DNA sequence: AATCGGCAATGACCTTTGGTCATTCAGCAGAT
C-alpha cells in the first residue's frame, strides 16, 4: 500500500463510522455527526474513544485509530477539532 | 456544547493610522469595543497596541462568521503565526507584528483555501480602499481562486460604516428566528422535506429553511445529505420545498439558537 | 512580389554598388565604402546622387534610388548618415 | 569628413544628488568640464540644470566611443526623445522634458544599443553609481535579448581594492600613444610591406592602409581588405571585432580606424601627442 | 489648480543600540 493510500482508505472508514451512526432522539444529545454539522468543536480524545469502541469494527475496519489520525481527519474535512 | 453559535465573532487586521507599516492580528466578538481597548479609551488593550506614538489604530479588514470562539481563536493563531501553521492535515501537538500588509493578505488568502478552514461559513470584509486594493492585487495574480461561496464584501466611508455597521447581536436573523419559534411552538413542522418522515416535537434535531415565508423543516442529517448530493460539512444548498438557496451556516445559527440558546431567543423577540 | 522582399533586394544592389567600387588611390579621397568603414557621417543626397549616376546600373539595377531608401539602407547597416 | 575620429565623445546621463528623480541627457567630449558647467563653476551650462536647489549634479552613467560628434548628437537625440525616435530603418527627415524615471532611461538606453542604426557602433557603456548599475542589470536580467558580447559594459565605483568616475576618463589620445608611435615609425620609414590579407605590395601613399592594433605587430592592410577579412556576419558593412592574420591578436574595428584617421587626417594632433 | 509617480525621510523593530524593513500615515520637490 501507499502511505497516502492507507490514509485515504482509513479516512473513508472513519467517515462511514461517523455518518452511519444513529441520529439523536434527544436534540440535546447530538451524535458525533450532528455535532460536526452544527460546528461543535470536536474534542479529539473523545471522538477517538468513540471510534475505537466498536464503530470502526462495525464498518469493517479491524484496527485502532490514533488520536492524531482523527485530528488529520478533522482538518481534512474542515471539521473544528481540539485536544483535551 | 452548551452555547449556541455566536451572533458575531471576528478575526481582524488592525493597523496604525500613524505608521501604516505597523499591523496586528486579533479576535473579538465586539469589533467596536475591542478597537476602543486598543486606542486606550477602555481598559484591556494589548501590549503591542499600548504604544502612545502608534495610536489611534483602525480595523482595515476582518473575517467574520466563525461558528465558535475556538474556531476564531484557531484561525487567529494560524494568521498570526504563518511560519508555524501547517496547512497539510497533521497529527500535531508581545506579538511579533506581521512583515507587511502584502504578507497578511497572502496568508489570509491562503488560510481561506486550506482544508482546515475551507468550508467554514466565513466572510471577508474590507473597510479601506488601499487594503482592499492589495487584496485584489494578490487575488488576480493567484491561480487557485476562492470559493464562490465565500462572500468578500466592502464598506468604504462615504456615499455608521465599517466595524460600526457590523451587527453585534442576532438582529439580522430575528425574522428567521421568529418564524422558527412559531413553527415549533405550534407544532407546524409537518414532515421532513427530504426523507418525508413525520417529525414529532422533540424528536432529534430538526433544521429550518432560512428563506422567509417558507416553513420547510427536516432532520439535520437529512438536510446535510441533501446539500452534499467524501465530504462532511455542507456549505451552500437549495431548499427542496421553496427552491431557494441557503447557506449552511445560517441554518445552523438558528438551530443552535432554538436548541441551546432559548434565553437568547426570548431576549431577541423581546 | 513582396514589399519587404523587394526592399531587401534593393538593399543588396546598393550594398554591391558601394562595396565593389574601386578603392581610393589618394587616401585623402576615400570611396563611399571607405568613408563608411571610417565612420564618416554620410551625407545622404551625396551618396544618393552617386548611386543613380551609373552605379546601380553597373551592378545590374535599372531604376532610381530615393534618398529615403538610401537612408533606410544606412540605418539598417549602422552606417551613420545625415541630411544636407 | 575632414577631422579625425575624436579622442573622447560621450552621451551621458545626468542626475541630481538632491533629487534622484531629476535626470538629464547630454553629450560632450569633456565630461569633467561639462559637469562643472551643470553645477555653475564654469560658464556655459544648461537651463534645466540652472536651479541651484537641484545642484550639485552628477553623471551616473555614460556611453563613450562615438566615432563622430554627429554620431553622439544622433544617439543623444534618440535617448532624449524615445517617444519620437523611430528604431525601424526610416525614410524620414537636451531634455527640456526630463526623462520619466531612471528605469525608463535604463530601459531605453538598453534598446538604443540593440537597434540597427547604432548596433555596430564602437561604443562602450560606463557606470559610476552602484544603484544606477543595479537598475541596469535588473533590466538586462529580465530582457531576453542580450547585448552583443562585443559591446563592453564597465564600472568605476568610488574607492575600493585617486581620480575616479568621469575624472578617470582620458580626454585625449594618450591611451593609444604607443600604437600611434608604432604607426609613424612604420610609415615614416616605409616598413608597411604588403597587405596581410591580399598579399599585394603597398607603396607609400597608395590608398588607405590600416594597421594592426596589437603592440609590436607589423600587420598593415588595405582598408577594404581588413574589413572583408573581419566580416568574413550576414549582409554587414561595418566590422566590429576581428583577428589579425599575422599576429593572431583580437582587434576592435573602432580602435584601428581611430589610428587610421589620426595618421591620415589628424597629422598635427599626432605631433602634439608624440611632442615631435 | 489639483494630480501625480517616485523619491528621502522617517519610524519601529529587537536587539548585533543600528542594519533591517516598511511606510508616505497632517510629506515632498518638481513637472504637466
Ligand atoms: Ca461607501
Ligand atoms: Ca541596365
Ligand atoms: Zn429526514
Ligand atoms: Zn424553503
Ligand atoms: Zn589588400
Ligand atoms: Zn597583428
Numbering used by the authors:
A (entry chain D), C (entry chain B): 842 to 925
B (entry chain C): 4 to 96, 109 to 174, 197 to 266, 271 to 311
D (entry chain A): 4 to 96, 108 to 175, 196 to 266, 269 to 312
Paper lines:
These crystals diffracted to a resolution of 2.7 Å. Unexpectedly, the DNA substrate, which was designed to adopt a splayed-arm conformation, was found to form a double-helical conformation, in which the two single-stranded overhangs were base-paired because of partial complementarity, forming a slightly distorted double helix with a 2-nt bulge and a G-A mismatch. The asymmetric unit of Tt-Slx1–Slx4CCD3-DNA crystals contained one DNA molecule that was bound by two protein molecules. The protein bound the DNA backbone through basic amino acid side chains (R22, H23, R51, R54, K101 and R102) with a buried surface area of 637.3 Å2 in the better-organized protein–DNA interface. In the new Tt-Slx1–Slx4CCD3-DNA structure, the DNA was located away from the active site and occupied a markedly different position from the position that we predicted earlier. Therefore, upon DNA binding at site III, a part of this region that comprised residues 108–113 became ordered. We hypothesize that the ordering of this region is coupled to the proper assembly of the active site, which could serve as a safety latch mechanism (i.e. catalysis could only occur when DNA is bound at site III).
Slx1 comprises two distinct domains: N-terminal GIY-YIG nuclease domain and C-terminal RING domain which binds two zinc ions.
